[PDB]
């Protein structure tokens, strides 16, 4: 998150970090024992640290669970970054808490000029490299389909939208994939990809979640 | 478009160390040790370095 500032402690409960040896993508708790991200995050071995809030020191919150199963959307494109969802079963129920709860599935898809939550601890600086210990947060608006795809012509499908400032300076960035971007309550993104980061009319693209539901839905009902 | 070394990137260009060209599009990933380059150079989308550059 470039250009944000600082969540208040556990004010982003549904909020996890994916780690092997370290974080390497954020993520979504959508019910007790599910987690949501992106497919471009996908590794054999997954631990899920939850109730986080300074990745760098154990706080005496948080609770490691490793995942049990991964699955990844089966028309997930690696070139094109198409159907960017995973979804991870943990192998033991989370204890919901305060520091500890699920996001809300969409009930529809937002509309342009939505403002949306995008929180993680990815990258804070857009011209060089600096990762934060403290969850960062960025309020932000869903750009239209129009002003998304003049942005990255050829690039984007119906399965994502922009979420950001044409005007650049605030946007995610490396280490936030997989992470949520809510709006009324309800998950509407998944950090995905874009050029660069907080680049001018380079806004950050996220996967259009409110188009998974039947499919979310279905493969929890089987697993 | 950013400053780099003796030049300056302008538009549509990336650094590279020293140099202006390249492109960086990328999926935003951690990479332990940055992203995949071998034989142009600068990086690759998605793709981490799992040994460095
Ligand atoms: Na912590």
């Given at each position: 998150?470039?250009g944000?500032?600082?969540?208040?402690?556990?004010?982003?409960?549904?909020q996890?970090?994916?780690?092997?040896?370290?974080?390497?993508?954020?993520g979504?708790?959508?019910?007790?024992?599910?987690?949501?991200?992106?497919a471009?995050?996908?590794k054999?071995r997954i631990q899920?640290?939850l109730?986080?809030?300074?990745?760098?020191?154990?706080?005496?919150?948080?609770?490691?669970?490793?995942?049990?199963?991964?699955?990844?959307?089966?028309?997930?494109?690696?070139?094109?970054?198409?159907?960017?969802?995973?979804?991870?079963?943990?192998?033991s129920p989370?204890?919901?808490?305060?520091?500890?709860?699920t996001?809300?599935?969409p009930?529809?898809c937002?509309?342009?000029?939505?403002?949306?939550?995008?929180?993680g601890?990815?990258?804070?600086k857009?011209?060089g490299?600096?990762?934060?210990?403290?969850?960062?947060?960025?309020?932000?608006?869903?750009?239209?389909?129009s002003?998304?795809?003049?942005?990255y012509?050829?690039?984007?499908?119906?399965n994502?939208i922009?979420?950001?400032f044409?005007?650049?300076?605030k946007?995610?960035?490396?280490?936030?994939?997989?992470?949520?971007?809510?709006?009324?309550?309800?998950?509407?993104?998944?950090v995905?990809?874009?050029?660069?980061c907080?680049?001018?009319?380079?806004?950050?693209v996220?996967t259009?979640?409110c188009?998974?539901?039947?499919?979310?839905?279905?493969?929890?009902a089987?697993? | 478009?950013?400053?780099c070394?003796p030049?300056?990137?302008?538009?549509?260009?990336?650094?590279?160390?020293?140099?202006?060209?390249?492109?960086?599009?990328?999926?935003?990933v951690?990479?332990?040790?940055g992203?995949?380059?071998?034989?142009?150079?600068?990086?690759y989308?998605?793709?981490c370095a799992?040994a460095?550059?």
């Amino acid at each position: 998150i470039v250009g944000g500032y600082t969540c208040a402690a556990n004010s982003i409960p549904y909020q996890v970090s994916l780690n092997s040896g370290s974080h390497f993508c954020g993520g979504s708790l959508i019910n007790s024992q599910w987690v949501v991200s992106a497919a471009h995050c996908y590794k054999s071995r997954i631990q899920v640290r939850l109730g986080e809030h300074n990745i760098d020191v154990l706080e005496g919150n948080e609770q490691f669970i490793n995942a049990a199963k991964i699955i990844t959307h089966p028309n997930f494109n690696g070139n094109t970054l198409d159907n960017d969802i995973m979804l991870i079963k943990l192998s033991s129920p989370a204890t919901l808490n305060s520091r500890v709860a699920t996001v809300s599935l969409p009930r529809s898809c937002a509309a342009a000029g939505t403002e949306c939550l995008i929180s993680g601890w990815g990258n804070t600086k857009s011209s060089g490299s600096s990762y934060p210990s403290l969850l960062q947060c960025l309020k932000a608006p869903v750009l239209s389909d129009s002003s998304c795809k003049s942005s990255y012509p050829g690039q984007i499908t119906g399965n994502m939208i922009c979420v950001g400032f044409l005007e650049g300076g605030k946007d995610s960035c490396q280490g936030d994939s997989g992470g949520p971007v809510v709006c009324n309550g309800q998950l509407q993104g998944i950090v995905s990809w874009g050029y660069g980061c907080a680049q001018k009319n380079k806004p950050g693209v996220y996967t259009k979640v409110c188009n998974y539901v039947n499919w979310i839905q279905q493969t929890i009902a089987a697993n | 478009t950013t400053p780099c070394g003796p030049v300056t990137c302008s538009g549509a260009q990336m650094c590279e160390v020293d140099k202006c060209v390249c492109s960086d599009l990328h999926c935003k990933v951690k990479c332990e040790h940055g992203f995949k380059k071998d034989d142009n150079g600068c990086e690759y989308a998605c793709i981490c370095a799992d040994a460095p550059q």
